[PDB]
Design a protein around this ligand. Structure first.
Ligand SMILES: Nc1ncnc2c1ncn2[C@@H]1O[C@H](COP(=O)(O)OP(=O)(O)OP(=O)(O)O)[C@@H](O)[C@H]1O
Ligand SMILES: [Mg+2]
Ligand SMILES: [Mg+2]
Lengths: 20, 339
């Protein structure tokens, strides 16, 4: 499922902002 | 809709007064006992603190001046404080004090003890559409307010939205907020929430906030973002494609709203058309939304965080703690004169 693929992925925790 | 344009007009005049003459130096470090880190960032951290004289709790964002200069973030940092001290709105976190010392810049905000929307969303999995709509409505009003002041927010995401004791949203993290009347070009934001025109280095305007609202609503209702992968470059490929698939449980009205917010073509994106924010406020997905009642915070919240006292941090993750160092020599005084 899409949810299962998300939860198994590397970006499910807090996401930092970016700039450059 | 006549009450609101008169409200915005008066709002712009008090904002402009503070924008033109910002407050400075309204407290000092030893007036606060530092208790716990609530979050960290590239240039420092946010700590729960207790103000000695009043006993009130606050969230103190601490920025290392030398590191801000090193990473060429002076303008963004000065933007953040100049804008936050000048705004006033029921869903924006309040800046209560600010000051600097030899080493650091300090922004002391009201402490929003309910924690990040992010934590609650990941814990519960996803929000039902009325729950998601209650939050979305607050962001719609808040962007209406900010954009009327020629401000662009540029970092909407559940990590930057706090839930207060009433269950309402408080927007924090003005680190990329900018007052601009033209287009602007900085690549900044958070990968999953970047509009296509940011990625494509086209120049962009306030419409990127409305795109981000589309991403936020999707993530709140689905429990995962519309564009995800393990690395940003892969996320960017998906965003610019603009192909979006919706969960089977999304209502027809929600899918329609999102097709219009997650619109890759600037010409067609809701929030950016001739009717502006009213295209959003009048969309069928918001038919049950009493916009004035939301603004007045009279709608019952779908969720209320439990707090065991002022100073409770149970709704926040734990972070590694660090001594706050203040040099006996002034660092970067000229760079941050106006702070
Ligand atoms: N007023 C506040 N009350 C309670 N917690 C807060 C408050 N402001 C910030 N925080 C907490 O501290 C965290 C970091 O704050 P903030 O997002 O301003 O830092 P940042 O370094 O700009 O992060 P980024 O740019 O990576 O999103 C927030 O995500 C939130 O968990
Ligand atoms: Mg943040
Ligand atoms: Mg930030």
């Amino acid at each position: 499922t899409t949810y299962a693929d998300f939860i198994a992925s590397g970006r499910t925790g807090r996401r930092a902002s970016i700039h450059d | 809709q006549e009450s609101v344009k008169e409200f915005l007009a008066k709002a712009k005049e008090d904002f402009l007064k503070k924008w033109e003459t910002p407050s400075q130096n309204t407290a000092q470090l030893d007036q606060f006992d530092r208790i716990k880190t609530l979050g960290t960032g590239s240039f420092g951290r946010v700590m729960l603190v207790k103000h000695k004289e009043s006993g009130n709790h606050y969230a103190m964002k601490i920025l290392d001046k030398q590191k801000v200069v090193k990473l060429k973030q002076i303008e963004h940092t000065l933007n953040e404080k100049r804008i936050l001290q000048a705004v006033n709105f029921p869903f924006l976190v309040k800046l209560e004090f600010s000051f600097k010392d030899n080493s650091n810049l300090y922004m002391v905000m009201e402490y929003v003890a309910g924690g990040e929307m992010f934590s609650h969303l990941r814990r519960i999995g996803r929000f039902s559409e009325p729950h998601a709509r209650f939050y979305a409505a607050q962001i719609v009003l808040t962007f209406e307010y900010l954009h009327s002041l020629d401000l662009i927010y540029r970092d909407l995401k559940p990590e930057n939205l706090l839930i207060d004791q009433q269950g309402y949203i408080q927007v924090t993290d003005f680190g990329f907020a900018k007052r601009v009347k033209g287009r602007t070009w900085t690549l900044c934001g958070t990968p999953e929430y970047l509009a296509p025109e940011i990625i494509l280095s086209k120049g962009y305007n306030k419409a990127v906030d409305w795109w981000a609202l589309g991403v936020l609503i999707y993530e709140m209702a689905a429990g995962y973002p519309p564009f995800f992968a393990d690395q940003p470059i892969q996320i960017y490929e998906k965003i610019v494609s603009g192909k979006v698939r919706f969960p089977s449980h999304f209502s027809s009205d929600l899918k329609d709203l999102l097709r219009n917010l997650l619109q890759v073509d600037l010409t067609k994106r809701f929030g950016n058309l001739k009717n502006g924010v009213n295209d959003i406020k009048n969309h069928k997905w918001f038919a049950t939304t009493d916009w004035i009642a939301i603004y007045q915070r009279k709608v019952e919240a779908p969720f209320i965080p439990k707090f065991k006292g002022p100073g409770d941090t149970s709704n926040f993750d734990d972070y590694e703690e660090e001594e706050i160092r203040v040099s006996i020599n002034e660092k970067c005084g000229k760079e941050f004169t106006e702070f």
